[PDB]
Design a binder for these strands. Structure first.
Ligand SMILES: Nc1ncnc2c1ncn2[C@@H]1O[C@H](COP(=O)(O)OP(=O)(O)OP(=O)(O)O)[C@@H](O)[C@H]1O
Ligand SMILES: Nc1ncnc2c1ncn2[C@@H]1O[C@H](COP(=O)(O)OP(=O)(O)OP(=O)(O)O)[C@@H](O)[C@H]1O
Ligand SMILES: [Mg+2]
Ligand SMILES: [Mg+2]
Lengths: 486, 440, 106
DNA sequence: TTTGAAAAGCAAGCATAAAAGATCTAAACATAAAATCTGTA
């Protein structure tokens, strides 16, 4: 058979098609799923990434501060912890089904406190105060396809691998018809729910609908970045019909961020260290004893700057880590140390680490361009000063460049550079319609994002706009000693 | 360590080719561009350079035959495998299917799998992948060439076989889209009239002097090369303003006018070049590069559609109205002052069906006449002829697909030039110029 | 020197060392002996020839390759485009301008 | 034979329809591996 096209790289998973409604003859024929070694979960790739080191690492006194300010390593989230914990505990002890929607901006401690509530629930179930439950964590931004959540959750429930539609019918039949005495309670963390709802609202409506079933024994914790995601993905009738718990996560204040930072630094500040003077390795208590500190006002202004802009813990922790890294860079450069009295992280280190975030490189990039690129930007600024359109044709820029060269003939620099600009300093080269490196600087300003150019194959009538603002361009061209006097 | 051949007006290009293309991969760029317009000798110079250096391993691909990006990737994988197993026949290799390459990443993976089985070679070699006509690809988005610039970065740097890309492109603006990549580029500027004449003489004199018609003409009744060269310069002097500096167009004109020039060669003309030019002077005044049945209702409908497209609809009563009035009234006075732009130089205007049928009725040719009513009405033959004119695209609409013929929003316009409608009107002896003489 | 002149020229136009390397490479590679290489680095005449080649297919070098009929049609089209309000023209208007132009010359 | 005067013409300015197409979606058309269902054995 002669084919019209070929698909030669099809890789298909060995996933079955038959849903759970056909695994048994009747609803009364289903055994105890808790007493089954494939149900409810009743990582071999670590040794791939393993090797042996030859030389010992020199662990500098600041590397403790850097390692201990990582996001991988619950002050201020007590009402949220209490609310999620009492909703989940009350629904678990009553063998009911509930759903808690948690919203907020990134980095405010949403996933962390939901996980801490879940571990506290697991510890209480270890003391047999509440019945046992399965914990499933489903992240919408960790998927190839949004329907794979259906494949994931059922695989955590039954242990078998199905396709997503059959998994959806299996989960529907599990939460609807399977009796409560033959099943276990399930707590689902639906993180990044906006990643799974972009195409359509099937996953949102299915997961919220399963908690309305009397047989479900299902706890769904759904975490998102906007508050009106259920109100705009489902109607108000549906959201009134489910009745989810609604919890917002406001950004941290500066005092809360400060307590977070020095609770990360509780055992390290104002502490002693035995430091090897020839290598720089430090051991927490030929050897010098060095005290280490971070000042209070540095953390204070860092947490004050973060709480004004974003209020998230990740930025505050990362500027503290960057300040410690800057201090350790200067320390290692001063003492000549390698990789294999009082040491302080100062206010100026936090200032510099914040200034790398605060400042922009647009003006600095534009002041170090060539004369032709600055000529292009100056001609563009002259054109938007004259006709006031904010989009200029490229031919108008060419004519404005030609006019600026022709007018300033008495200037020493323009007289010295015009032969370069229109003949590349050579008498065998004819006078060109464009300047030398015209398309080079046009492509460079388009690649940098300074410019925007429309898609048009006529090079004269094609339009170009500044993609930054007019004031950084004015500040850049007034820095140049050539452009600012003409 | 390389040979620089002689190409007659491409000495600088050959020196740049010798400076860039080498068998040592350490001193060879990853990408090389040869940019020039049509007939500038890019293919000729590259072929001469690679045939002067037979130790250089080159694979020739013409991307005008592949059309899309996926056949180009498949052709790269297939031709690289073929060149390697006819270059190293004592190296056992797994023949990978080129049809499995459906992505650029799949090309990277397949080329890596092809190149790892040639690690037993002694020295590092170069594979020259000549993409002769990259911008002759028919689809040709902007982002495709960026995939081919950065292709060498994803391949192992310490491999025995290193792929080198040589691109040939036509348009300057396509090249200037990628100016910041700083790829080495050799330009092939267009030849002048002297260079075109010398190239045409050196490429066509041996074929013209050994043609069958000339040796039939010398039996029917150095100097053969002289008369072939003289014909080539006569063709150039007659037709350089028309062809420009095109080698191909002048080659077609030489091929068209050679037998008609041979057929007028006599004994008095073979040793007299000016008299032989005057004997066949008709071949040099005209280029003659060309290849040189509608109904009467279709013809008059085309004429009426041209009239509707190029006369504004507020003066038709000043031209076509002729019938005696029982009721007092005035017709249109006519246009007051003439326009000074010929409207047939511009695009046609749009009209409705009933205006076309009214003007068609006006311009169609004409006691027993009491029951005659001698005026042709638009019956089904007129509408069938009009629909046939639309499906032949001598009439056009404002929309082209899923056309609503019966909607009043859809308008019609003529789709023929003035010469076609002029010879159509002279086919039916209609004075179409009389409707345009007084208007401009 | 000529080398400092070309480096200054690159600094003011391109400010790109790879651009300069793309010109220096065939200056070195086309030298046949040591004295030729020293003469080539003294003069940098090859850099001028390279710069002339790099501009040979822009709108200037393409203009000098045209025939007189091609140039006449281009000038006629430019005249119609300059007189037009939107700069648009077609073949008929350009031919009319060309034929009245040849008539006024003759 | 005039005449005059209302129909016709024309143009500047402006609100709006509409042409051309950029962008996108969905249906028809097409393939393909794993699972699942059928017919004998
Ligand atoms: N209250 C807190 N106490 C201590 N550390 C915290 C606190 N809140 C956040 N962090 C730190 O900041 C990190 C970010 O928190 P988390 O991952 O819970 O944020 P999130 O609100 O879920 O963010 P996103 O929307 O980006 O997923 C945590 O991993 C932790 O290191
Ligand atoms: N320098 C030359 N010496 C001799 N013949 C030449 C020369 N340049 C071109 N020709 C002749 O003209 C023909 C056209 O040249 P060629 O096909 O190499 O041009 P090109 O620039 O690659 O064209 P295209 O853009 O159409 O692919 C050649 O096949 C050859 O016969
Ligand atoms: Mg999170
Ligand atoms: Mg070619």
């Amino acid at each position: 058979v002669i084919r019209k096209f070929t698909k030669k790289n099809v890789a298909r998973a060995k996933k079955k098609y038959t849903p759970f409604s056909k695994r048994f003859k009747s609803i009364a024929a289903i055994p105890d799923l808790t007493s089954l070694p494939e149900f409810y979960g009743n990582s071999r790739f670590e040794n791939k990434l393993k090797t042996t080191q030859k030389h010992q690492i020199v662990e500098t006194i600041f590397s403790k501060v850097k390692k201990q300010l990582n996001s991988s390593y619950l002050p201020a989230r007590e009402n949220e912890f209490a609310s999620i914990y009492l909703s989940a505990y009350s629904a678990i002890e009553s063998d009911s089904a509930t759903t808690i929607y948690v919203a907020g901006t990134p980095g405010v401690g949403k996933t962390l406190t939901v996980r801490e509530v879940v571990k506290e629930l697991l510890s209480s179930s270890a003391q047999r105060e509440i019945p046992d439950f399965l914990y499933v964590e489903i992240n919408g931004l960790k998927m190839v396809k949004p329907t794979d959540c259906y494949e994931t959750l059922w695989n955590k429930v039954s242990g078998e691998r199905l396709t997503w539609a059959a998994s959806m019918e299996s989960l529907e039949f599990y939460f609807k018809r399977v009796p409560k005495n033959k099943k276990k309670t399930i707590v689902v963390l639906l993180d990044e729910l906006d990643a799974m709802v972009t195409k359509s609202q099937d996953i949102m409506y299915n997961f919220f609908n399963w908690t309305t079933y009397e047989n479900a024994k299902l706890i769904v914790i759904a975490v998102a970045n906007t508050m009106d995601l259920p109100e705009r993905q489902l109607g108000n009738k549906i959201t009134s019909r489910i009745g989810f718990t609604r919890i917002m996560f406001t950004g941290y204040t500066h005092e809360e961020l400060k307590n977070i930072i020095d609770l990360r630094l509780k055992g390290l500040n104002d502490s002693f260290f035995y430091v090897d003077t020839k290598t720089g390795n430090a051991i927490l208590i030929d050897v010098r004893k060095v005290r280490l500190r971070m000042s209070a006002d540095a953390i204070e202004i860092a947490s004050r700057k973060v709480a004004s802009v974003s209020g998230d813990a990740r930025r505050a922790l990362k500027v503290c880590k960057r300040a410690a890294e800057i201090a350790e860079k200067h320390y290692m450069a001063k003492h000549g140390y390698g990789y294999d009295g009082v040491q302080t992280v100062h206010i100026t280190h936090v200032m510099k680490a914040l200034n790398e975030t605060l400042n922009s490189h647009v003006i600095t990039f534009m002041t170090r361009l060539s004369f032709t690129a600055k000529l292009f930007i100056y001609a563009l600024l002259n054109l938007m000063k004259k006709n006031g359109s904010q989009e200029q044709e490229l031919g108008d820029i060419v004519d404005e460049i030609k006019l600026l060269i022709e007018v300033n003939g008495s200037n020493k620099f323009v007289m010295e550079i015009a032969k370069t600009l229109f003949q590349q300093g050579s008498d065998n080269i004819s006078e060109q319609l464009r300047i030398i490196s015209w398309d080079f600087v046009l492509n460079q300003l388009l690649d940098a994002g300074i410019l925007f150019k429309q898609t048009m194959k006529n090079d004269r009538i094609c339009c170009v706009k500044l993609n930054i603002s007019v004031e950084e361009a004015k500040r850049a061209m007034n820095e140049d000693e050539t452009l600012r006097n003409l | 360590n390389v040979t620089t051949p002689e190409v007659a007006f491409r000495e600088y290009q050959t020196n740049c080719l010798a400076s860039y293309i080498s068998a040592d991969p350490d001193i060879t760029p990853s990408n090389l561009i040869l940019q020039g317009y049509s007939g500038t000798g890019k293919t000729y110079t590259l072929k001469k350079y690679f045939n002067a250096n037979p130790n250089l391993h080159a694979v020739w691909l013409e991307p005008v035959e592949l059309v899309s990006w996926k056949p180009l990737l498949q052709a790269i994988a297939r031709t690289v495998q073929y060149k390697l197993k006819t270059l190293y026949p004592n190296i056992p290799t797994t023949d990978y299917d080129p049809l499995q390459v459906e992505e650029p990443f799949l090309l990277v993976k397949t080329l890596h799998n092809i190149f790892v089985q040639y690690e037993s070679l002694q020295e590092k070699t170069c594979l020259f992948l000549i993409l002769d006509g990259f911008d002759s690809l028919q689809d040709l988005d902007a982002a495709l060439f960026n995939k081919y610039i950065k292709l060498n970065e994803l391949l192992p740097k310490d491999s025995k076989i290193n792929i080198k890309f040589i691109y040939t492109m036509l348009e300057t603006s396509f090249l200037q889209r990628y100016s910041t990549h700083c790829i080495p580029t050799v330009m092939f500027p267009r030849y002048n009239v002297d260079e075109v004449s010398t190239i045409l003489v050196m490429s066509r004199c041996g074929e013209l002097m050994e043609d069958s018609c000339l040796r039939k003409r010398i039996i029917e009744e150095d100097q053969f090369q002289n008369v072939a060269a003289n014909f080539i310069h006569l063709i150039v002097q007659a037709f350089h303003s028309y062809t420009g500096n095109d080698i191909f167009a002048l080659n077609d004109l030489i091929d068209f006018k050679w037998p008609k020039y041979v057929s007028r060669i006599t004994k008095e003309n073979i040793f007299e070049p000016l008299a032989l030019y005057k004997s066949a002077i008709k071949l040099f005044l005209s280029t003659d590069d060309n290849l040189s049945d509608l109904s009467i209702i279709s013809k008059y409908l085309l004429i009426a559609s041209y009239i509707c497209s190029y006369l504004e609809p507020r003066y038709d009563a000043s031209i076509f109205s002729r019938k005696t009035r029982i009721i007092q009234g005035r017709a249109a006075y006519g246009r007051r002052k003439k326009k000074e732009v010929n409207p047939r130089y511009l695009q046609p205007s749009l009209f409705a069906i009933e205006r076309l049928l009214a003007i068609f009725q006006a311009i169609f040719p004409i006691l027993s006449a009491l029951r005659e009513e001698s005026l042709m009405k638009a019956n089904i033959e007129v509408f069938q002829n009009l629909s046939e004119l639309h499906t032949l695209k001598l009439i056009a609409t404002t929309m082209n697909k899923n056309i609503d013929y019966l909607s009043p929003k859809v308008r019609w316009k003529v789709n023929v030039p003035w010469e076609i409608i002029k010879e159509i009107s002279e086919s039916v002896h209609f004075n179409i110029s009389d409707y345009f003489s007084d208007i401009h | 020197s000529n080398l400092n002149r070309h480096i200054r020229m690159n600094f003011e136009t391109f400010r790109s060392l790879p651009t300069l390397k793309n010109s220096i490479i065939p200056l070195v590679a086309t030298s046949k002996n040591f004295g030729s290489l020293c003469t080539a680095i003294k003069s940098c005449s090859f850099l001028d020839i390279y710069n002339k080649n790099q501009l040979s297919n822009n709108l200037t070098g393409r203009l000098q390759s045209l025939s007189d009929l091609e140039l006449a049609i281009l000038i006629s089209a430019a005249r119609v485009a300059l007189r037009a309000k939107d700069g648009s023209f077609n073949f008929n208007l350009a031919y009319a301008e060309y034929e009245k132009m040849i008539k006024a010359i003759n």
